[model samples]
Target: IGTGFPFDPHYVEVLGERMHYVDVGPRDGTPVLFLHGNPTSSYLWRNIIPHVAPSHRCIAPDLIGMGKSDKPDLDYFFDDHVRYLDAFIEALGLEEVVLVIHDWGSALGFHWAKRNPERVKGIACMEFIRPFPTWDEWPEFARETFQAFRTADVGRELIIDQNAFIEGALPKYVVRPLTEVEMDHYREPFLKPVDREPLWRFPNELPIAGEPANIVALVEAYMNWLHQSPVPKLLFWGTPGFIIPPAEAARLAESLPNCKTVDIGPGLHFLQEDNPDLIGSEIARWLPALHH
Candidate 1:
């Protein structure tokens, strides 16, 4: 849980906003895209990237309204994120890439790979939002957590006013207690209550029970393609994962073609924070296979 980001601040003009990214390692190597989720940033992979950077080009970008990226005037919805991500890739001219994605990032990456199948070299995902679950299907704790987040005034009170996502929800998910330095890094982006809107908006965007018909449909389409696609995948699931539980990981692994599943010990929402070394080393070993 180091506080400082060693890599230089690299930025590219994506969708008219400056998108901050960490670009390190061999400049000529194929890009290894590390995508983070809500209340987290490229800094989430601060420890993980180095494990592969010596051999590969590790690129972790802050989403439009998250991290060091410019807070442009755009509704931070699923579709809007995709548009920015799409433009980011275009701006960078990343032809074929490997993705190490987590949380909402899984949705962004999976959707990207589904559409541009040939462009995706491989995928290694943990705490990925797959097999979209209904309210009844999700665990009681998650249901309770999300219910308050999705509530009308409750969301504003919890995420915005209290900054619950960073200080509270984050610690509950990670196995190791975050240090003061680490906690401050996560808190840096949403210092002001109003700036926490993107953090608050993320819960409302959860595609549950087919209610958010478009997002659910998109997830379904990508999942279908993913299960059938010949693209090599590494599903780094945890013991009791937040989105895909151990039981569900087994089911998902069995179906995904050319897939390998690695249980990276105990973790829940944020696997990187729990065991970055295991995740990093495993990917460091697996990455060579994708280099064609």
Candidate 2:
């Protein structure tokens, strides 16, 4: 909130919707794509982009219907998000990309990179979706609330009507108390009740306990690819994380080749909010190595 997202806004037509993004730094330099998950947008990378943008082409896109982007009336499903994201990359003509991803954005990165292995240069991921976990495997604290989010009418009521995601969940996930301005910025996008539909869909899309077989299969396939892929990768994890906990991070570090997991101090799911400087510096350090 202190140093707001001051970069110029950029937009392009993707799947008939205008997607908003902040394209910063040297255009001719290597492209670094930053992807934020549900309930957050390009604003998530405001401070981090500066560290790498000086020497790299940094593009942080607000997923369709999320940030300053136009909200088209349609079902905001997982595949719907992917379709627009694919077009976003094609419209920008990005090739040989380096992905800096988090939250649900991580799943998109994992899928995109696996499906187009040759196009990906490397990845720096945090709080991303890995293999699907059973409901039992999920953390005790976040389980039941998320269960309600997965419920049919309950999900809509909690996310859309109440605006609990930004009002309640965001503050809880992020370590520090978000400033009024910062919290307001997050809430600004989904002012209308229906605009929060995307937020509701994200939790439901999680491939937990093999509810949705197709997504579960997709995640498993990506995990297999991730384990085998030799792409240079970096994992930024917190001391006691929510998604990528320390124990799981260690297991993930061993599973992926040429991957390093650094403890970025105390953080929850929204690690970017808590460790921007360290995350930015680590990502900057990791960038030079991806100049393959």
Candidate 3:
């Protein structure tokens, strides 16, 4: 896993599972916690972390059942992820955190901050999911995808048996092609059929049709909190992605108080892979201003 990932790996016991993370930068510096989404890990931030760590403590964790983290016998539901994330934060005693999130990271991070707003300093997010308010708000493609994953058997076979989330879906969402070595870092974790439970379950958590009331309420509560909270926020957006397209990004920026938006250009859902330098530099520049 050494391609460009230079940090030493560390693990702590959370929710009876070994949670893996990379803790770098100054011990007493401001904390910048990077939470990754499905099929990726702390490795996703390898290019971005170096830029911020010199001035801020950068901590990126592999959520349970992803990256090098322990894979336990569990269903890997949305609540399960929140429980693990809550424990991970508690175990490490993280405070005054500037959360940097993408994809599902935004959901988990924002939901956590809703319960403990004081602990959060600011947020930098891309390709994030927010509450739909109604099922009709979801785009046709998103609705179709969610329905396929939740109702169709093919979704299970693709994610669980064929590992399509990492092997197929991931590649489609990035503008830059991943090197074979980089692909290996992600592929090594969920090679086995049983090891791919997290990938299989994540898509099913999409709150389509208001069926999963808990997740819908959690997102709704957090979306409300986002509007009310005084915390500074920066939203990064890319092109050719399913989640958080330009129109939605504009709406998000407009809706959230004290939030700024940036166009990172010519990328898909995983903008970090397409524009790490821009992403890192933008956050580095944006974060300092928030502190003052």
Candidate 4:
């Protein structure tokens, strides 16, 4: 299942489902866990892992129902993701975890850190924020985009039936054009309508209209934690990105107690596709500096 990828594949039983992950680098090295976001899997970190693995223990997992992870019959709700993530960490006995998060991964990471602060060492994140902005707070295009996804029938047709997230949305967001082989690998997991359940469900969970009160509360708590926690954090922001625009990124940096911000040049939401080298190297440098 890991052919053509940099690391070998592995899995562990968590919450009765086989959770797939890429675990590499020295066993005794500092642990760096990379978490990807919607419509993507651990594959999103393929280009970045090798650079960090030589010096850190790199672990990138396919969030349940995405990539090679088992697709069980579940709603794939925000809580579902948090539950699996918590169990996955416990099952692996991971401690002093350096969380690297993107998109929904950011939400899950923040929530986990808030609940288990001692286990988390630090955070390096991009393209996501806590207490997700309301629809009215978003730009015109972003508001329209959210509206399209929130609309019941249209969202289903685009995400599930048409597989637009894998076929259209993802590719459109990436700055670099993915090769046919790369695209094939991404599309491999979500070829069927039923298999695309998680993809469609993720967008719906966005705190639009203040729906999903539980998730909104989780985000609210984490945002408060972010403001108070002494945990060191690093944020990477790219220009013209849809999720964390410049203003929001700056606000996050200023709000966090021990946070650093880096500008990674022009790119869209999927900045990993634009400059993995820069992101990886920045993290490599930042991690060591934090302790010294």
Off by over 4 Å in 2: 1-3
Candidate 1: where is the Cα deviation over 4 Å?
A: 131-133
Better of 1 and 4 by TM-score: 1
TM-score of each: 0.97, 0.98, 0.93, 0.94
- Predicted structure with the largest lDDT when compared to the true one: 2
Compared with the true structure, what per-residue lDDT tens digits does model 3 show for residues 119-160? Answer: 898999898877565657765555655566666688898788
Q: What is the C-alpha RMSD, rounded to one decimal, of candidate 3?
A: 2.1
| Residues 148-252 of candidate 2: C-alpha lDDT, one tens digit per residue | 999979989999999989998898998888998898789999989988989998888888888667778888888889999999999999968888899999998
Q: State the weakest 10-residue window (summed lDDT) of model 1.
A: 130-139
Clashing pairs in 1: none
Instruction: Please provide, for model 1 over 171-258, each residue's C-alpha lDDT reduced to its tens digit, 9 standing for 90 to 100.
Output: 8898888888888889898897888878887878888766577888888888889988998898887878788889988987888898
Query: Which 10 consecutive positions of candidate 2 have the poorest summed lDDT?
Result: 130-139
**Model 4 Cα lDDT, one tens digit per residue, 222-275:** 888888999999999988776788888888888888999999887778888888
For every candidate in turn, the CA RMSD to the true structure comes to 1.2, 1.1, 2.1, 2.2
The global C-alpha lDDT for each of the candidates, from Candidate 1 onward, is 0.87, 0.89, 0.84, 0.84
